[PDB]
Structures are given as structure tokens and as C-alpha cells.
Design a protein around this ligand. Structure first.
Ligand SMILES: Nc1ncnc2c1ncn2[C@@H]1O[C@H](COP(=O)(O)OP(=O)(O)O)[C@@H](O)[C@H]1O
Ligand SMILES: Nc1ncnc2c1ncn2[C@@H]1O[C@H](COP(=O)(O)OP(=O)(O)O)[C@@H](O)[C@H]1O
Ligand SMILES: NC(=O)c1ncn([C@@H]2O[C@H](CO)[C@@H](O)[C@H]2O)c1O
Ligand SMILES: NC(=O)c1ncn([C@@H]2O[C@H](CO)[C@@H](O)[C@H]2O)c1O
Ligand code: NA
Ligand code: NA
Lengths: 311, 320
């Protein structure tokens, strides 16, 4: 199975149908004022572990989410996991606690400015990755700080290959803790903005990071992604989206495709392309888990986009 | 009585403790990513009409809010208006509807990115400003677009002097409706970002806008403001804030002080300084309306900041 460690959250996403870049005026005192009209609030199922597991499950992989929810309002998510066939083995529900909630203000370029209400996520460390069983691959995504570090240490001690995915949790790390996490990790995945923040906080160049992992995966929105190794790089093209509606969750859809490819022994070019396709499927729908292709549809779309079938 | 036309809303304010300028990376495909901790969601009383009226009410003015609320969740705001002595005369409540809700992300530089769910605000044009009685002064601020345009037409035709504050409503305007609104307006009040957008959309220079109103007022955050009128330009200083907690609503607090000064025949220098003071008292507290200086405290702080007592002139004051 693949262990997916990270936040499990309800999202309130406000997507500007536009680009904040077109609205910044650095020569004025105020850089940006923008008010945009949105529809009625829809609470979405989200969280990085929710999102990555949803994607891996769409592909037919065996996704085991490890994260904490709050008993006050966990039930709709637990019912959804059961409906989707997502194991709740490592989903811990904490009495008298609220689930994490994200208020995400964003645009069509995935410039997410998020106000996060952590709730139960603050106690995510009560789950220990070292207590999970029969795990062949893992990811450690944004979560409570203690939990992220503890998951990294326990997976490394067991020798389980894992992607370190610090994402929104990057502020929680200092240089020394970030360096150690990258030394421990088998792979690191970040978007291009976060990759710059990781280089600044560690002091390492991208080449130096690539000397300390099997792969440094940097996603670049509409421009695709790069997969960097100590001895070469794969450029992964984007798939043209059917429509660009909401990029929130694109990286997590991408990580679920990547995880499936690594588990199934795809080469990096092919694992990266599957990941890219999942990101393009996601962006065509509002909310991180609204896209719902069947496995047959994903296979067809991969052939259409890339001119071959994986293996 | 001063008619305050604009949104009436509940605000959810998410304060980034920093400056967006320090986190923009234009060379990346993602310009900015932030994720910051916030406490439990708490709705604050907001909307431009609520904020401006609250400021005018703190000064002892007679503020008449004109706007729409939704019955499902209007009651806390109605009860608050009653507690404060704000007339509900022109506050219309729509059945089976939610009130406007703003989800506002701020930084410390007073940058705002707001997702706005209009709710009852979509029907703001059901109130007609030209029908309000014995109004001596008005402001038209951000609101449902049809309401904003309608209020401007009606106030101009009734001959009521009014400030035009397109504010966050600017995206809804085109050049033609924006130029028309400015032609009709007695004064325009904007922050500098908005002032740039007005010049861009109208095709007018600040000079050209200034020629079509009695005063063009441009606020510049902690740098203060300018008031351009017939005879000159007032450079209005900021008042040093006791602390900076939340800039949301600083321009509205400023507009309340400006409206009080215009009503009472303050000179522009003095009306501007009162407005500037209200902006500073507001930023020291979370929410657009939680600052609650007594009227004596306002006068004492004006004296400390500026060295004189803020007074007006009956001859220059407004009558209905
Ligand atoms: N506009 C887009 N068109 C097509 N695919 C996209 C687009 N935006 C993102 N994707 C796919 O999703 C991946 C992850 O998106 P990105 O925005 O980099 O991630 P994150 O969500 O972590 O910021 C991209 O590498 C790309 O494959
Ligand atoms: N940091 C500050 N310190 C002191 N006064 C401030 C500060 N920020 C704003 N103000 C006062 O509030 C007024 C309006 O703020 P501004 O940010 O221009 O408006 P808006 O809220 O409309 O964007 C300023 O002209 C100033 O008088
Ligand atoms: N941990 C954090 O600070 C954080 N901020 C946003 N998120 C989640 O990030 C996902 C988007 O990639 C959303 O579903 C959110 O719930 C987070 O986990
Ligand atoms: N009309 C709009 O698009 C809009 N956007 C924000 N606001 C209000 O603007 C006030 C701050 O000036 C807040 O209290 C918000 O309710 C608005 O009225
Ligand atoms: Na490593
Ligand atoms: Na005019």
C-alpha cells in the first residue's frame, strides 16, 4: 500500500476568474485591491492527504490516508471515504475537536493565499507512520509540524521510499530541519515558488538538493514540470486542459499520479506524464476532488495526450 | 441627515501579518503562495455603508444607511443599529435571503483581496436615494452596480451634494458609466490604487477628473491623503497609529470624518485631518467598526495630533 500523510480538511475556495498578476500596481502605495464576486460558499472535501489519496484511488492504487480529523464535523468526510473505498485505517478522529478548514483565495495561475484553521491537524502527531503496516511507498505532505518531522524520521528509519512534500507547511521549518528532511527523503516534490523558498531556506542549490534525493520534482503550472536528478533532468509537458476553472489541488492530483507511476515501475518520463495528466483533469473542475474520471477515461486521455500507453 | 448608500455586509477578515510585496516572485509561474494560521471564524459588522455610517455616528452626526440586508441573517445587524442609534429608515430587509458576505485577505500595507458574495446586495437598487427626505449630503459607495449608478443619477437630479466612492465596485463600471458618474458627483473619494484605475478606465488624467468635481480626494494609506479643490491641494498628514492591527475599513472611517467635516463647514484642511484621524483610530482595532472612541477622545486626539480644536463654520455648513 501507499501511505499518504498530510492534512485532511474542508476547503472554502474562492477562485478569481482572472490573474492577480494583471491587477498588481507596484508603483502605487497600495499594490493590489481587488474585490471579485463569487457564488454561494461550497465547503469542499480537501486537505493534502485527502486530495492525493483521492487521485491515487481514481487510478486504482491502494491509498492509505494518515491524518487527523475532528469529531465535531468529521462525519461527512468519513462517509465519503467509505463511499470511495478509501481505507480509514489511519484516519484518526479526535473527540471534541474541529476538523481543519482552509479558506483559500486564489486565481487561475494557482496563486493560493490561504488562511488555515488547523483544528485537529495540530494533533496530527498522535498518528505514527512507524505504526503503519506493509507500506511500500509514502508521501509526507503539509500537516502539523511535529507530525511532518516524526513521519519523515519513522519512514526513513524503516527504509520506506517517500516523497517529502512540505508545500504549505514550509514556514514551519527552519534551515536545519528542512535540510535534515531532505537528507532523509527519497524524493522531494514542490512547485516552482516553493522550490525557490526551499533553496533559500536550506542554502542549497537545486543541484545540491538533487545530490541528496533520487528525484527533485518541481511543478510549473501550465508549463508542466521538471524532474531533476544528480545526473540529468526530464522535462514533463503539461496536458492542455479542457477548461481552466480552478487550479486548487492540481499539485495533489499530480502527486497521486506520480505515486501511482513510482509504485508501478513507470520510468520518470511516464510517471511524470501521468502526474501531469491528473493535474490537467483536476483543473477543469471547481474544487480539489470534483473531477471524477474513470480509470478507462484516464487511460484514453493519456493516449490522446501523449501518443502511447504506459507500462 | 446624511444619506450613506453602499453595501451592508458581514466581513470575515484574514490578516496576513506581513506585506504581500515581500512574497511576490514574478519570475516563477506562481507569483505568490501563502498559507498562514488564523483563529476561529468570526463575522464582523461591515459593508461600506455600515462602516461609513458607524464613523459618522461616532462623531455625533446623523447617518442614514441606505442598503439591503437578507432576512436569514440580518437580525444581529438590525439589533446593532438599534443599540448604536443608527436609523433603519432606509435599510431594507429581503425575505428568505442571506446578507452580503465578504471574505477579505489583508496585509499590513492595506492591500486587500476580497471574495464578495453579494446576497441581498444584488437587489440594492430597490431603494431609491432621490426619495429620501431632508438629506443634506450623501455618499454613494461600493454596492450592487445598478444601485450605485441609480443612486448617482437620483442624487444629482435631486440636487443633493454627494461623494462618489466607486471603490471596490470599479470592475463593474465601463468608461462611459464611470465618466458619467464623475460628471454628476460633487466630490470623488478614492484610494490611490483606485484613482489609477479610474484614470485608466475614464481616459482622464487626475487634472481632468478634478475639473469635473468640487474636490478629488485620494487616500495614500499611512502616507496620509490629498484633497484637490478649486484653489489648491491640501496635503493631509497621517496620524501616527497607536498600533496597526487591521487596515480593513480605514478608507470608510476616513469618509465618515470627511462627511462630518463637509456637513459642519470645516475647511478642507480640517475636514481632511479629521478623516485622517478616524483612519488612524480605526487601524488600531480588528474589524472595520470595533474602534469605539468617545467623542471627547476624538477631539483630544485631534488636538494632540494637529495642535488645534476641530471646528467648522455655520456659514460654510450644509442645510437641506
Ligand atoms: N493551466 C494548467 N493547464 C494544464 N495543466 C495544469 C495547469 N496548471 C497545473 N497543471 C498541471 O498540474 C501540475 C501541478 O500544478 P501546480 O500549479 O504547479 O501545482 P501546485 O498546485 O502544487 O501549485 C502542473 O505541473 C501541470 O501538470
Ligand atoms: N498605517 C496607518 N497609519 C495611520 N493611518 C492610516 C494607516 N493606514 C491608513 N490610515 C488612514 O486611513 C486613510 C485611508 O487608508 P487607505 O489605506 O488609503 O484607504 P482604503 O481603506 O480605502 O484602501 C489614510 O489616508 C490614513 O489617514
Ligand atoms: N497545512 C496548511 O497550511 C495548508 N494550507 C492549505 N492546505 C490544503 O492544501 C490543499 C491544496 O493543495 C487544500 O485542499 C488545503 O486543505 C494545507 O494543508
Ligand atoms: N462591493 C464590493 O465588491 C465590496 N468588497 C468589499 N466590500 C466591503 O468593503 C468594506 C471595507 O471598505 C468591507 O467592510 C466590505 O464589506 C464591498 O462592499
Ligand atoms: Na534524501
Ligand atoms: Na461632477
Amino acid at each position: 500500500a501507499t501511505l499518504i500523510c498530510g492534512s485532511i480538511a474542508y476547503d472554502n475556495i474562492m477562485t478569481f476568474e482572472g490573474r492577480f498578476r494583471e491587477h498588481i500596481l507596484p508603483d502605487q502605495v497600495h499594490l493590489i485591491n481587488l474585490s471579485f464576486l463569487v457564488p454561494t460558499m461550497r465547503r469542499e472535501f480537501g486537505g493534502c492527504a485527502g486530495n492525493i489519496a483521492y487521485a491515487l484511488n481514481l487510478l486504482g492504487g491502494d491509498a492509505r490516508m494518515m491524518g487527523t480529523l475532528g469529531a465535531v464535523d468529521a462525519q461527512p468526510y468519513l462517509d465519503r471515504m467509505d463511499a470511495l473505498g478509501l481505507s480509514r485505517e489511519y484516519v484518526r478522529v479526535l473527540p471534541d475537536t474541529y476538523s481543519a478548514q482552509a479558506m483559500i483565495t486564489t486565481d487561475l495561475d494557482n496563486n493560493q493565499i490561504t488562511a488555515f484553521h488547523p483544528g485537529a491537524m495540530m494533533q496530527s502527531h498522535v498518528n505514527h507512520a512507524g505504526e503503519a503496516k506493509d507500506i511500500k511507498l509514502a508521501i509526507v505532505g503539509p500537516d502539523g509540524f511535529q507530525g511532518m518531522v516524526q513521519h519523515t524520521e519513522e519512514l526513513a528509519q524503516a527504509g520506506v521510499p517517500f516523497i517529502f512534500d512540505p508545500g504549505q507547511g514550509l514556514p514551519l521549518f527552519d534551515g536545519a530541519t528542512l535540510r535534515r528532511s531532505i537528507e532523509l527523503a527519497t524524493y522531494i516534490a514542490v512547485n516552482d515558488y516553493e522550490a525557490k523558498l526551499v533553496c533559500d531556506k536550506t542554502g542549497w542549490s537545486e543541484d545540491e538538493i538533487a545530490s541528496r534525493v533520487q528525484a527533485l520534482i518541481i511543478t510549473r503550472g501550465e508549463h508542466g514540470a521538471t524532474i531533476r536528478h544528480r545526473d540529468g533532468t526530464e522535462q514533463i509537458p503539461a496536458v492542455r486542459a479542457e477548461r481552466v476553472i480552478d487550479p486548487t489541488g492540481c499539485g495533489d492530483a499530480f502527486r497521486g499520479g506520480l505515486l501511482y507511476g513510482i509504485e508501478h515501475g513507470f520510468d520518470w518520463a511516464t510517471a511524470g506524464r501521468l502526474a501531469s495528466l491528473m493535474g490537467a483533469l483536476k483543473i477543469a473542475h471547481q474544487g480539489p476532488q470534483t473531477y471524477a474520471p474513470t480509470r478507462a477515461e484516464i487511460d484514453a486521455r493519456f493516449e490522446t495526450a501523449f501518443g502511447y500507453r504506459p507500462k
